[PDB]
Structures are given as structure tokens and as C-alpha cells.
Write a protein that binds this DNA or RNA. Structure first.
Ligand SMILES: [Mg+2]
Ligand SMILES: [Zn+2]
Ligand SMILES: [Zn+2]
Lengths: 50, 1343, 49, 79
DNA sequence: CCCTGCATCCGTGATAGACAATTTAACACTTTTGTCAATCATTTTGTT
DNA sequence: AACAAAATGATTGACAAAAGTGTTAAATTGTGCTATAATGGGAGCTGTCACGGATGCAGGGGA
């Protein structure tokens, strides 16, 4: 949904964004792993395990 | 109004101020408060400043169009336009005189030095505190004695007549009125000759020069005491009614009401006959109100009523707001928006939104809709454009067929900040802009806006297409380097396209041209960078502009072939065969300019941008968190220097080492560990990949996407990669001192709080300078472009045979600039030949373009004599050949071009980014060549060494071709190695000297004579036996104590019989003054040899933080400030000799082969008693100011000093600027000359050099000589004041002092300039307007 | 603000400088659409006419 | 259309009267004087002026002789 | 009995109550436009 | 093959019709007064810096 430029990180030394862009991906990785489990309505025993 | 010229200014007499005005303003009231019509005889009258409503009287008896000139009888308004209420003037009739606060309180009091009266006494008379006599006659009183209240009253009882004393402003009108400028003029022409005083007969000629102005000008003296103050017109100080009832008055109707009220009362007290304690307090109160009007602030600052800010008088309206009141002009037909990218455009077009272009081009659109008959009348076209009917969107597109617009960004530094463009209508609200040009404006695309203008007339949209178009400016004017280099993203596209892997898809196959190499990669077989063999036909222009094919089998990649299909014909294939970084693209456009001209290079500079952007998108060049590789040995490199420093702090613990050698030893142990991390990191990024062949493994250059952006030069370099992976340096606290512990973690691991608070500082000093370097460099380029304003190429060739010599700069063992890049694009005054005689290769004066340089590159010339613009002989400008070659274009500089202002911007546009192993033991050069030394007088000694004498020993390491390679300097304490013609080994010392000591080596030995170095008088008595050391410091000229000051320290070397042994090659015996800081080991009693070191003079040079420079040096260099410690010079080459001493400071003599000049006592001289000195040679030590250089060595001497320092602040920052630009400011900086002889000028004045050379070329040209001058040198701030005009000075400098001095003399500004010619609003005389000025001076004085 | 799936890569020069590209799925869903509320005032003074 | 006047300076080598020469010929085609010599291609009057100069059909000398005849050519109407 | 040498200083940057002469605005009207009709010529449907 | 007649422009003065130059009444504007004892002095300010050119003291150095 956006296409930033990678020639902004070498000069401007903000390596925050390139780390928030990964941890922002692991968090939304759990998002699609629960949204599938909750969509087959597996159980309230499987959710509490994950 | 006719073609006027020569605005003329002078004083105004009360019979003239009564002639502008149309009536007397005799009440303080303004309007009526009930019906807001203005009252009669008040400030806002209608009988005085004309009517209010257009074409009708005030009462209401004359409205018809029949009565159009009559003046009404009820209220005498003249029925005319209400515009005439804007250019009439009134006048108040003062009931008593009053001094003009400008001509009374301006620092040289023009009322003062016209009477020879101390200004503190005139002020004691204008307050009615002390009488003053007039016409004393036969009594004990002069004409201007200051009788106090008693002394007059103690004088008045004796005499009643033959005597007149006055007091107050009506007295100075009596002194001036009777004084005669002819009697005391010639009578002072004699008094100046009798007076013998360098101060008296220097100010004496100042007064007599003022009296000589008040006569030929035509101004009487007593016009500087007002008697009718004129009032402004009532529409330049409006009383407009705001919305809601309040009015918004100007701040002058508060000051005029305060004079007309006080003046109106003082009319009454002379009819009611009050005592003289009140009316004498009235005039003192009026005169403070007239002087609060002219220039309020030089008094008690009569702050506004009903508010607490000071009022704003008349002279606070012209006075700088940083610039003029007139034109130094907000503008119609404009706009502004947020720029964006739009990379599909050609080079010569920019987007322009429909919603804007429909609003700037409105009056044009009205033309079509009434021309094509679509609208009947103009009112019916205004309603068709408001509806946005679907027809106007097709008429608006034909109005914008070829109509160039002008984009311009806000802080316009240089001339490339304004460029035209041909618009193309897009939809949106952002002004798109071609990416190549965004580096000229210096525009990032993160919110920067850009105005757009519109050239209206028919000559104004050709000047926006011939001169200003965006495809004409591909060479920046500051230097020939391009300005359309593909900047940031494309340059990484091409670098990725033209590399080579080691084993990719389809390696070793052989292709059949660029067309097969492309489609082979598109289909998917071969990789974009895989080694391959193609066949490519390159062209080559070798005849008179013809091309020839040459087919062969080049060995390349697949990437380079695809890029070969873009390059035009004339270029060779060794231009796209390298790795193609960013330094190689920038030249690949340059060679395409010098060869194929500008038609293909503008269309080749776009095929790069379309190819770079394309193949970077397929690259997928992303950056991650594992791209930045941390080295594995970072721990060991950090722990060793961690422990190794823990064991030096102990050495200070047990008191072994002092702290200063504790601190600097800890700094240099971290710098070892800080540099073993970069060298341990970059060797891990560079050779990252190790890929395999079909057989073994072999390594290459990496493909690390955070290295590729550093090696291409796309963005950032190893000075910043070192902080993402390596260790993050060591920081400085606010003093400027380094902290002991460096921040030891990069930006991939965290920085704990105490490491971040340390780093947080440097981001504050970083921002508090860039916020200031703009405000500071914005004032250095505002002065350069106001001294160099009026300079213009105004002749095709001058004729003068006098130039300068352009020797390449020599930086010890390195060259700062090659000889070629300094002399490219210039004429040649004397045709140099081959070093063999009669080998004239470069002819008489010709342009040194890209070939005649390399022709002189093939040969072995070491210097050329080029024509510089500081020596041209033209009047008012410079010829074409003298200036030279440079332009955005490549031709010679066209006649008429305005080189003045494009030279002051090339020096000011930098600076915004230019804000600001130290051992020195052995003279080790990279070369081996003969040594040719000049300005030396040295002798071999018994030590087997050519003995050193002074610091005139420079070591010119001649190369194999008759040139110079390296320059050095050999001071005392320097033992020499080789001779003359015998070389020196690779990195070997022909001469070694003492770094840590400046010793004196023994020329002649013998016993020692205590010559003014006796114990106690020069240094207290200390005993030291046969070992040969001591603790005795022979102090020097500025390091000597107080007691025995009748001595000059030196130990007289004596011969075998007892005489003072002499210096070989001179007259004086050996009296070798041991310089300061000298712990002299040589005490008498022991015999020494000839060739021993006499005393230590230490010199550490550890740290090297003892240098000036920066941006203030460039401003402090042009202004020519005397640097607090100047170096003396030799006014005449003769014999050295001294005289009477200890007058508080020493003295000296100079005599031809008498000239007497003193010398203070602080400086260790650099001369001997028996010496023949060269004129203007260093007699002492000090950074000599520019004034002394010009007075002695010549005009080319002060030029080559300024041009070499100011070029020494930039080149150490990497800023290219041609030194032609710093010579059209050293020309405009010394155009004032003072006279010596006479015949037409008065022998001590100051006149412009053009004047002295138009008489001397005229008077001496006629049958009688009937002068001699001396060049002067003044800063850019004082040299832009003394111009001939008075508008080019009053515009930018202090204004209160340039109108006062011009009004007294009655100047006549002849409008021959630029900044004096844009004010009046006409064609500036340089550029497209210079042509029509050829016809205006060719019209007057003839038909 | 909103948080949207971002990718670091140079795309065809449409993000040359610091500028940004944007998909049209961020305009359809209306996640960046803000609301503004102006104000206009019309006073009717008491003139002397 | 015209993008660069590099060709139209090869005739008039100055670049500062190429404006003057072509800003004056470009007026004759706008205010009712004359018509273009070269064939127009749906262009304005400035670009057609800069396209004649390239063809040598116009320069600062021709425009004088070309129009100084008009007085003599009007001299038949001048009687 | 006479010049050169610091040093202080200033500027330009960056607490209420009768008089009168006065002014507008009002009501009043003459000339200037708007009808508002009867003679002076130009004709007036098709029989005299 | 020429006007029978029936208006109809063109043509006269006449009721009307509106609306602009001088009298009264209301208001605004202003002028001159008013007699316990009152007697110097109200009055604000600040954290810039650097360069330059006088006006003055100063006292060193020469008749
Ligand atoms: Mg920006
Ligand atoms: Zn009137
Ligand atoms: Zn010249």
C-alpha cells in the first residue's frame, strides 16, 4: 500500500523505521494466524493455546 | 514624461518650499466626526490637497459634467480627479526658525564644521542656555564667543550698541547668514600652508573642502535652518476607515498634529506678551517637535500616545528594512504549490494544474472567447469561465501552446534558481517538475513550494526561451562542471545495470550486437550482469566532422551492451565499459557536450533518466536489518583498548605521568581502536560474496545493498556506513574538547541513556549553525553584489599587454591544483613557446580551450602569462578578451553580458555548506629530481653541510621536464643533505631540521664574548660546568623581563686572535642572536667546534588546533581588515642601520644606495645591521595586511594574495569556484586613487581612477603635461559608499548619511548602472537592454 | 494515524526524492480521509446611509 | 515547435539580439503587418520567428532592406 | 614649549451650571419631461 | 387603367408632473465665567556584539 525509497536510510541514520517495519510485520503475522483460526471456529481451547 | 536622466538633489530654500505647496495648513484637526468629510484649512483639507470624490466639489453644488474645471465658490475645491489628492503638498509657516536635525546631529556636524564650532557648544545654544555674540566690533569679544548668562549680563551693562548677542535657533541663522564662503575660502588657502601638523593640516583640508562645496553647488549656508516645514500629501499618510467604525491612521498624523499645535500656541504667546521664561521655553519645545518629525530617535524618543511603541517618523521610512523603499515589488500573475516528481516529462517542461493555469492565463483566455465569437462581449466571457464550461478547457489548451512560465524557488542563491519551462496541463494541485532539474533549485520533494510567474509581453516570452530556458543551462556559471548530473536514484540504477557477477545465467556465450543483448535478457535466459562477448560498431569523428564505423568484438557484460544502445554516435565504447558509478556518469555527459554539442546532449541526458529509473525498479534494491554486517572481531578490538587504557590510568595513579600526557595518550589509544574497526568492517562488506565457478571458489566485490548505495555515490559514504556497522566515534562536549570515552556502539545495537545524552549535544551545535550560517552568508553575498553591481563587459578588446602569471599551486609534496585547470578558458598575453627557444606553439593571445591546453600538456611549460580582469585598461567596465572564456555556454563572453552580478553570486552561493600525522620531522618527498633554490644565501660548513641562514630556503624539487614539483621552506636548525643537480632518494631528506627545537648552528667557533647576555641583566647568574648545559633562557623581543633592558642578546663568536669573527658574504662579524625559548647550553669556559647547535627553541605542534579560517575569514578577507599584528616592510631597498634606541620602542634607518622609520620592541627582527634588503621584503614577522601589500609590491601582488587565501578556504572543503570570479571583486575593490602631483587636482584629494586616467590621457596627450597618483584599497562595505552615484549608495548602506552628504554638495546621479536603473523602472544597461542603450548615448550630443 | 503495509524499493522513479507512492486501496477504503469544519460570519452593521 | 535556439544562434552569433531580431519580426506576424515565410505548423508567433532565423530568411540586415523598400514602394502611393 | 598614545563614547550593522451665532432640513415652488389629444400630408383596399 | 376613400404618419399646444433655489425652527457648536488653604518636581530602566571614527587627555619626545 506504500512504496517508500531505500535511499533515505543510508544518509539519514534513522534505523528505527527498518526495525519497526519488521516488528510491525511479526505483529501482523499473528494477525493472520489468529484470523484464520477464529474463522474456522476451531475452539476456545485452540485459541488459548496459541 | 520625456527621456530624462540625472536625478539631481540639493538643499531647499524657503522660497522654494513655499513653491511646491498649494496653501498653508493652519489648524490641527483632520475630519468632522459627524459627517466624515474633511474640514477646511486642517490637515486633510480639500481646498489644499484637492477634492475627495472624483469630479465634484465638497458642498455639493458642482456634480454635472459641464462644470469640470471651475473652483467652487462656497468651499474652494477645484473639481478634478481625486487622484490629484495624492501629489499636492501643503506647508506650515514656522513662527520661529529651527535647526534641521540632519544637518545638526549627523556625526560630522555640517553646521559645525562650516562654522568651526565644537558641536557641544552649538547644542548649548540651541537650548537657550548660553548666549552667543554676533558682530563684536571694537571690544574684547570675538565673533563666536559663548557668553554665559552672567558674562553677557556682566558685559551688557558696559556696552549697549556696537554689540549684539543672540540665543537659540535664531542665532545660528545669524552666524551662517553673514558668513561668506569666499573670504574664508582663499584666506584658508594660505592658512593651510603655514600649518605644520600631520593632524592639523589633514583636518584643515577637510573644512576647506566643505566650504568649496557650498559655492559651486549654489546653496547658501543658511538654508539648513528651516523656516517653512512642508507637509506630505494626504494620501501617503491616509486616515482610511476600517470596517466597524475604527479608523487606521498613519503614524504621521500624530506627529503633524504635535507641530501645528505647538507652533500655533507660540504664535499666541507673542501676541499675549508672556515673559521670556515661557516663550523661551516654547521655542525649545517646538524645535524638539520638528526634529521628532524628520528623524525621531536621536532625542528622548517621543513614544506614541495611547500606546507604548515609538512613533515612525519620515527618515524611519526610507531607512533600511534591510533594503530600499522602492524596488530593492510584489507581482501579479503568480502562484505557488507543493512540488512533486513526475518523472515522465521531457527536460524542458513542467506540470501545471488546470485549476492554476485557468487563473493565471485569464486575460489571454478572454481574448479567444471573444475572438472565436463564442462570447459576444467580455462580460459574457467572464461568466463562461466561471462555469468552467467544457469549451474553455479546449481554448485554454491553445493559449498554452508555447507560452513558457517561470518557476522559481524561495531562497534563490544563484542564477540557476530561476528557469523557464513549457507547461503541460495535468490534474491535481502539485506543480510537477523534472527530476534532473531538482538539484539546481536544491529542492527535495518533501513539501517545498515553488512560485510560478508568467512572462506577458512578446519580448518577455523570448527572453524566457532564448536566455532562460531550461535546456540552455547545462553548465553552471561558477565553473564548467555540469549541473544536470543524474543525481540519486538513477545513479544507482545504472550502477546495478553495469556491474558483473562471476557466474550468472548465460556466461561466456557470444552475442551479435546491442539489439540481441537486450531481448536475450528480456526473454529470461541471460542475467542482467553476466560476462559475455558482443560485437559493437562505434563511430569516431576524425575528419572535418564526419563519422567512421569500426566493427570489432568487445568483451563486456550483458548490462553494458543494453546501455550502449542509448549513447549517441560520436562517443567511444570505453565510456560505458567501466563500473559506471556517479563520478563516471557526470563526465559521460561532459564529453558528450564538448564533442556533439547541445542538440544531442539534452536528448542524451534524458535517455539516461528513463533508463536509470527503469532498471532500478527491476533491481529491487531494498535495505534490511541484516544488510549492515557487524564485524566479528569488534569485541577483541574493543576489549584490548578497554584494558590497555585501564593500565595507563594507573600510570597516572602512581604519579608516574602527568595528566596532560595522560589525557592525550588515552585519546590516541582509542583512535587506534576506532580505526581498527573501520578497517575491520569495510574489508567485510567489500569482498562479501564468494561465489564459485564451475570449479573452485573465487571472491569478488559484494552485492550488499547498503554498500552499493555507498560505492555508487548515490547517497552517503563510508563516513556514515562506519556508524551503522562499526563503532560510532568519540564526541566533543560543548567547549570543543574531546571526551575521554567514545560512544562504543553503533546504530544497529542500542545506545543506552548516557551514550545518547552525549550524542544529543552534537545535534544541537549542528542545528544552531545551519540556522545561523544562512543568516550570515545571506549578508556576505548582499554586499558583494552591491560593490560589483555596475560592472559590465563594454568593449570587444582593450589592447593592454600587461597580464599575470598562473603558476600551479604547490602544497609541499602535493599539488593543490594542476596548471591546466587553472588556465583553461583564458587569453595569453605573451605567447609561450617550447622551453627550447623560438618554439612558439601557442600563438599570440588566443583562447585556451580543450585542445590548446593539452597541446601545452604534451609540451613542458611550467607557467603562462594570461590577461586578467584586474589589469584591463577600459573605462567603466572590462573588455571581452581580458575577462576570458567562461559561461554557461562555451563561447567567449559576449559583449554586453553582466559579469558583475554573476560573479558575486558564485562566491556567495557556497558558504552555506562550508561553515568551518602532525609529526613534521623529516623532509620526505615522493620524487627524485634536481634541486633549484632561489632567494637563498647559504654556505657549506666544516660539518659537511650547506649551512642554513634564514627562512628564505625553499626546496624546489625540479622534475625531469623543466618544471616544479614540490616547495618547502628551510629554517634555522636545518641540516642539508645534497647539493645542486644531485637528486634525493625516494622519500629522502635533502635537508633535515629540528622539529621540537629551533636551534642556532655554529657558523664559526672560538671563545665566547658576553655581548648583552651578561648574568642578571639578560638572565640571572646560574652555574653549569663542563657538561655543557644550563637553565638560562635568552628571552626575545616580546618575552623579555623588566630588569636589564639595555641589552640585545648574542654571544660574539671570536677568532683565533680575539677579534669578532665575520659572517662570510656580508659585513658583520658573527653575533648570532639566539632566539627566544632558548635554554642556552653554551657557557664560556669550554671550546666548541664550528657547526654546533647554540640553543634550543622548542616547537611541538601536537594537536594542530591553532588555525583560523571558516566563513568569517572569507568576510574578514574581502573587507581588508588590519590583523592586529602586521609585518613591517622595507619602503626602499638600501642599507640597514639603526639610531637612537629606548624611546619606549626601538627605531631604525633606511637609506638609498635618508629614510627614517621606527619599530616597536615586541618583534624579533629578521634582518642584520649590514644588509642590502629588497623593497617590500619581510623585515619582521606577522600576517601582513592587504594594505601594506598594495602600497609596496604592486596591483598583481594584492590580487595574488587575496585570490590565494580565499581559494584556500574553499578548496579544503571541496568547493569548485573559478578564480576569475575573485578578480572582478579585487578590481571593484581598489578603483579609488589618491593623487601625488597636480595639474588638475588639488594634490591630496581622493578621486576615482577613471578620472585620473581620462585627464592624464588627455592633458598629457595635449602639448603640456600639467599628475601622479597612488592606488588605494578599501573594503566592500566602504567601497560601495564612495561610488559616484547617490542612489546605489543610499539603497543598501546607511541611508541617513548618504543623503545628507549628497544634498550638501548637489550631486547629479547620471543613472549609469544597474541598481540605480531598476529603481526608476527602465531597461537595465546590461543584457537585452544593453542594445537599446547603444542608441541612447548615440542620440544626445548629436542628431 | 493509520498503519499500512509498506515496502522499501525504488519504483520507476515515482518516489525519486523523499516522496511517497500510494496504492488506490488506501483511497477507496477511506482511511486517510479527515473532516474539516470551517465557519463564515455575516454581520449587518448600521451605516449612516 | 522549438526546444532550443542553439541552431538559430549559428546565424546570429550573439544570443542577445537574437531576442531583439526575432522579437521584432515576431510582431509583424501578430499586429497586422505581414505573414510567415516558412510554413506554419499550428505554432505561435514567437516560434515561427525563431524558425525563420534558422533558415537565413531573416536577420537584422534583411528586416531593414525588406521594409525600407516600403516607403519607396509606398512612394508610388506617396505620389 | 611641541606630537603621539590610550580610552571613553556613539553610531550602524546583525472634575459642573448661559451665552450666542451657526448649521442643517424642513417646508415652499419654476422649468422640464410625459403625456395627451387634433391638423398636414401620404397615401390608402381594391370600387369608382 | 385612374382614384373611389380610410387611415396615418407628421403635426399644434396643454394638463401634470416632477423637482431645484431661498425662509423658519430646531439642533449643533463655542465662548467666558466660577474666589478656602492648594506653589518641584512624575518619569520609565536592564542578558546583545563587533567594527569604526572622533574628542579627549597624556607626557614622550623635540627647541
Ligand atoms: Mg525541502
Ligand atoms: Zn462647494
Ligand atoms: Zn582589456
Amino acid at each position: 500500500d506504500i512504496v517508500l525509497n531505500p535511499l533515505g536510510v543510508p544518509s539519514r541514520m534513522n534505523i528505527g523505521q527498518i526495525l519497526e517495519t519488521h516488528l510491525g510485520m511479526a505483529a501482523k503475522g499473528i494477525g493472520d494466524k489468529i484470523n484464520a483460526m477464529l474463522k474456522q471456529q476451531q475452539e476456545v481451547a485452540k485459541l488459548r493455546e496459541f | 514624461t520625456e527621456e530624462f536622466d540625472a536625478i539631481k538633489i540639493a538643499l531647499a530654500s524657503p522660497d522654494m518650499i513655499r513653491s511646491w505647496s498649494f496653501g498653508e495648513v493652519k489648524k490641527p484637526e483632520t475630519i468632522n466626526y459627524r459627517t466624515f468629510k474633511p474640514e477646511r484649512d486642517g490637515l486633510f483639507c480639500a481646498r489644499i490637497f484637492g477634492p475627495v470624490k472624483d469630479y465634484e466639489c465638497l458642498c455639493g453644488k458642482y456634480k454635472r459634467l459641464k462644470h469640470r474645471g471651475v473652483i467652487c465658490e462656497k468651499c474652494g475645491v477645484e473639481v478634478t480627479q481625486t487622484k490629484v489628492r495624492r501629489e499636492r503638498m501643503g506647508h506650515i509657516e514656522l513662527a520661529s526658525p529651527t535647526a534641521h536635525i540632519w544637518f545638526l546631529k549627523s556625526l560630522p556636524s555640517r553646521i559645525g564644521l562650516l562654522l568651526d564650532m565644537p558641536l557641544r557648544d552649538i547644542e548649548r545654544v540651541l537650548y537657550f542656555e548660553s548666549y552667543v555674540v554676533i558682530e563684536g566690533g571694537m571690544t574684547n569679544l570675538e565673533r563666536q564667543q559663548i557668553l554665559t548668562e552672567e558674562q553677557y549680563l556682566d558685559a551688557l551693562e558696559e556696552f549697549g550698541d556696537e554689540f549684539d548677542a543672540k540665543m537659540g535657533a535664531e542665532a545660528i541663522q545669524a552666524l551662517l547668514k553673514s558668513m561668506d564662503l569666499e573670504q574664508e575660502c582663499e584666506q584658508l588657502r594660505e592658512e593651510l600652508n603655514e600649518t605644520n601638523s600631520e593632524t592639523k593640516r589633514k583636518k584643515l583640508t577637510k573644512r576647506i573642502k566643505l566650504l568649496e562645496a557650498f559655492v559651486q553647488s549654489g546653496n547658501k549656508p543658511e538654508w539648513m535652518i528651516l523656516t517653512v516645514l512642508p507637509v506630505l500629501p494626504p494620501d501617503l499618510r491616509p486616515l482610511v476607515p476600517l470596517d466597524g467604525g475604527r479608523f487606521a491612521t498613519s503614524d504621521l498624523n500624530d506627529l503633524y498634529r504635535r507641530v501645528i499645535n505647538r507652533n500655533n500656541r507660540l504664535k499666541r504667546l507673542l501676541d499675549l506678551a508672556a515673559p521670556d521664561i515661557i516663550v523661551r521655553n516654547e521655542k525649545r519645545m517646538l524645535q524638539e517637535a520638528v526634529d521628532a518629525l524628520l528623524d525621531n530617535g536621536r532625542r528622548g524618543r517621543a513614544i506614541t500616545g495611547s500606546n507604548k511603541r515609538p512613533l515612525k517618523s519620515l527618515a524611519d521610512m526610507i531607512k533600511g528594512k534591510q533594503g530600499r523603499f522602492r524596488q530593492n515589488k510584489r507581482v501579479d500573475y503568480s502562484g505557488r504549490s507543493v512540488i512533486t516528481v513526475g518523472p515522465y516529462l521531457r527536460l524542458h517542461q513542467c506540470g501545471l494544474p488546470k485549476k492554476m493555469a485557468l487563473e493565471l492565463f485569464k486575460p489571454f483566455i478572454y481574448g479567444k472567447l471573444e475572438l472565436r465569437g463564442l462570447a459576444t462581449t467580455i462580460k459574457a466571457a467572464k461568466k463562461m469561465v466561471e462555469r468552467e464550461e467544457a469549451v474553455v478547457w479546449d481554448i485554454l489548451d491553445e493559449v498554452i501552446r508555447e507560452h513558457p512560465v517561470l518557476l522559481n524557488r524561495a531562497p534563490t542563491l544563484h542564477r540557476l534558481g530561476i528557469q523557464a519551462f513549457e507547461p503541460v496541463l495535468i490534474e491535481g494541485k502539485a506543480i510537477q517538475l523534472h527530476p534532473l532539474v531538482c538539484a539546481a533549485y536544491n529542492a527535495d520533494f518533501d513539501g517545498d513550494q515553488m512560485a510560478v510567474h508568467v512572462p506577458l509581453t512578446l519580448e518577455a516570452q523570448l527572453e524566457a526561451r532564448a536566455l532562460m530556458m531550461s535546456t540552455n543551462n547545462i553548465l553552471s556559471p561558477a565553473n564548467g562542471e555540469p549541473i544536470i548530473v543524474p543525481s540519486q536514484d538513477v545513479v544507482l540504477g545504472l550502477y546495478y545495470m553495469t556491474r558483473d557477477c562471476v557466474n550468472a545465467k548465460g556466461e561466456g556465450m557470444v552475442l551479435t550486437g546491442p539489439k540481441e543483448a537486450e531481448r536475450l535478457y528480456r526473454s529470461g535466459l541471460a542475467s542482467l550482469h553476466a560476462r559475455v562477448k558482443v560485437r559493437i560498431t562505434e563511430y569516431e569523428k576524425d575528419a572535418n566532422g564526419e563519422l567512421v564505423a569500426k566493427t570489432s568484438l568487445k568483451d563486456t557484460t550483458v548490462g553494458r551492451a543494453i546501455l550502449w544502445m542509448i549513447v549517441p554516435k560520436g562517443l567511444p565504447y570505453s565510456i560505458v565499459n567501466q563500473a559506471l558509478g556517479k563520478k563516471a556518469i557526470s563526465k559521460m555527459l561532459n564529453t558528450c557536450y564538448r564533442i556533439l554539442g547541445l542538440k544531442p546532449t539534452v536528448i542524451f541526458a534524458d535517455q539516461i533518466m528513463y533508463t536509470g529509473f527503469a532498471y532500478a525498479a527491476r533491481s529491487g534494491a531494498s535495505v534490511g536489518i541484516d544488510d549492515m554486517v557487524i564485524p566479528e572481531k569488534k569485541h577483541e578490538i574493543i576489549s584490548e583498548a578497554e584494558a590497555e587504557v585501564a593500565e595507563i590510568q594507573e600510570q597516572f595513579q602512581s604519579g608516574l605521568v602527568t595528566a596532560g600526557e595522560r589525557y592525550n595518550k588515552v585519546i590516541d589509544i582509542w583512535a587506534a581502536a576506532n580505526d581498527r574497526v573501520s578497517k575491520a568492517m569495510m574489508d567485510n562488506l567489500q569482498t562479501e560474496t564468494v561465489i564459485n565457478r564451475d570449479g573452485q571458489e573465487e571472491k569478488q566485490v559484494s552485492f550488499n545493498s547498503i554498500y552499493m548505495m555507498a560505492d555508487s555515490g548515490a547517497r552517503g559514504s563510508a563516513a556514515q556506513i562506519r556508524q551503522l556497522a562499526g563503532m560510532r566515534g568519540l564526541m566533543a562536549k560543548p567547549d570543543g574538547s574531546i571526551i575521554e570515552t567514545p560512544i562504543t556502539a553503533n546504530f544497529r545495537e542500542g545506545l543506552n541513556v548516557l551514550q545518547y545524552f552525549i550524542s544529543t549535544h552534537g545535534a544541537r551545535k549542528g542545528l544552531a549553525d545551519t540556522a545561523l550560517k544562512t543568516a550570515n552568508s545571506g549578508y556576505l553575498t548582499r554586499r558583494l553584489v552591491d560593490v560589483a553591481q555596475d560592472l559590465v563587459v563594454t568593449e570587444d578588446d582593450c589592447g593592454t599587454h600587461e597580464g599575470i602569471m598562473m603558476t600551479p599551486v604547490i602544497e609541499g609534496g602535493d599539488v593543490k591544483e594542476p596548471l591546466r585547470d587553472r588556465v583553461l578558458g583564458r587569453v595569453t598575453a605573451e605567447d609561450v613557446l617550447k622551453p627550447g627557444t623560438a618554439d612558439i606553439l601557442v600563438p599570440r593571445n588566443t583562447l585556451l580551450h580543450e585542445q590548446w591546453c593539452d597541446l601545452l600538456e604534451e609540451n613542458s611549460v611550467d607557467a603562462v602569462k594570461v590577461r586578467s580582469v584586474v589589469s584591463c585598461d577600459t573605462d567603466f567596465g572590462v573588455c571581452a578578451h581580458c575577462y576570458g572564456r567562461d559561461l554557461a555556454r562555451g563561447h567567449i563572453i559576449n559583449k554586453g553580458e553582466a559579469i558583475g552580478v554573476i560573479a558575486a553570486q558564485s562566491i556567495g552561493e557556497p558558504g552555506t555548506q562550508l561553515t568551518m600525522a602532525a609529526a613534521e620531522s623529516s623532509i620526505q618527498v615522493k620524487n627524485k629530481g634536481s634541486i633549484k633554490l632561489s632567494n637563498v644565501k647559504s654556505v657549506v660548513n666544516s660539518s659537511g653541510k650547506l649551512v642554513i641562514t634564514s627562512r628564505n630556503t625553499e626546496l624546489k624539487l625540479i622534475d625531469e621536464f623543466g618544471r616544479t614539483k614540490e616547495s618547502y621552506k628551510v629554517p634555522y636548525g636545518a641540516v642539508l643533505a645534497k647539493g645542486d643537480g644531485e637528486q634525493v632518494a625516494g622519500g629522502e631528506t635533502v635537508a633535515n631540521w629540528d622539529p621540537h627545537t629551533m636551534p642556532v648552528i655554529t657558523e664559526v667557533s672560538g671563545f665566547v664574548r658576553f655581548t648583552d647576555m651578561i648574568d642578571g641583566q639578560t638572565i640571572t647568574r646560574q652555574t653549569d660546568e663542563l657538561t655543557g648545559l644550563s637553565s638560562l633562557v635568552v628571552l626575545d623581543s616580546a618575552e623579555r623581563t623588566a630588569g636589564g633592558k639595555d641589552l640585545r642578546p648574542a654571544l660574539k663568536i671570536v677568532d683565533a686572535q680575539g677579534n669578532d669573527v665575520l659572517i662570510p658574504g656580508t659585513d658583520m662579524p658573527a653575533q648570532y642572536f639566539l632566539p627566544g625559548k632558548a635554554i642556552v647550553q653554551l657557557e664560556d669556559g669550554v671550546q666548541i667546534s664550528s657547526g654546533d647547535t647554540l640553543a634550543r627553541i622548542p616547537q611541538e605542534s601536537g594537536g594542530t588546533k591553532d588555525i583560523t579560517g571558516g566563513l568569517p575569514r572569507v568576510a574578514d578577507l574581502f573587507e581588508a581588515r588590519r590583523p592586529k599584528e602586521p609585518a613591517i616592510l622595507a619602503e626602499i631597498s638600501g642599507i640597514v642601520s639603526f639610531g637612537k634606541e629606548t624611546k619606549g620602542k626601538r627605531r631604525l634607518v633606511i637609506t638609498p644606495v635618508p629614510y627614517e622609520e621606527m619599530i616597536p620592541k615586541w618583534r624579533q627582527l629578521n634582518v642584520f645591521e649590514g644588509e642590502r634588503v629588497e623593497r617590500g621584503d619581510v623585515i619582521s614577522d606577522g600576517p601582513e595586511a592587504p594594505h601594506d601589500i598594495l602600497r609596496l609590491r604592486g596591483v598583481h601582488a594584492v590580487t595574488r594574495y587575496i585570490v590565494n587565501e580565499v581559494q584556500d578556504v574553499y578548496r579544503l572543503q571541496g568547493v569548485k569556484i573559478n578564480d576569475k570570479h575573485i578578480e572582478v571583486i579585487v578590481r571593484q575593490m581598489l578603483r579609488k586613487a589618491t593623487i601625488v602631483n597636480a595639474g588638475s587636482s588639488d594634490f591630496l584629494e581622493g578621486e576615482q581612477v577613471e578620472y585620473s586616467r581620462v585627464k592624464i590621457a588627455n592633458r598629457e596627450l595635449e602639448a603640456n603635461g600639467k599628475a601622479t597618483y597612488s592606488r588605494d584599497l578599501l573594503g566592500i562595505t566602504k567601497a560601495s559608499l564612495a561610488t559616484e552615484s547617490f542612489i546605489s549608495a543610499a539603497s543598501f548602506q546607511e541611508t541617513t548619511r548618504v543623503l545628507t552628504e549628497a544634498a550638501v554638495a548637489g550631486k547629479r546621479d547620471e543613472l549609469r548602472g544597474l541598481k540605480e536603473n531598476v529603481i526608476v523602472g527602465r531597461l537595465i544597461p546590461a543584457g537585452t537592454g544593453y542594445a537599446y542603450h547603444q542608441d541612447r548615448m548615440r542620440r544626445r550630443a548629436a542628431g | 494515524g493509520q498503519n499500512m503495509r509498506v515496502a522499501f524499493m525504488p519504483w520507476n522513479g515515482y518516489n525519486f526524492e523523499d516522496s511517497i507512492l500510494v496504492s488506490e486501496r488506501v483511497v477507496q477504503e477511506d482511511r486517510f480521509t479527515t473532516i474539516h469544519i470551517q465557519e463564515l460570519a455575516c454581520v449587518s452593521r448600521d451605516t449612516k446611509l | 515547435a522549438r526546444v532550443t535556439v542553439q541552431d538559430a544562434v549559428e546565424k546570429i552569433g550573439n544570443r542577445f539580439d537574437l531576442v531583439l531580431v526575432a522579437a521584432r519580426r515576431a510582431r509583424q506576424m501578430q499586429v497586422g503587418g505581414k505573414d510567415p515565410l516558412v510554413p506554419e505548423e499550428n505554432d505561435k508567433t514567437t516560434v515561427i520567428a525563431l524558425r525563420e532565423i534558422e533558415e537565413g530568411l531573416i536577420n537584422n540586415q534583411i528586416l531593414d532592406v525588406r521594409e525600407r523598400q516600403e516607403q519607396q514602394e509606398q512612394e508610388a502611393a506617396e505620389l
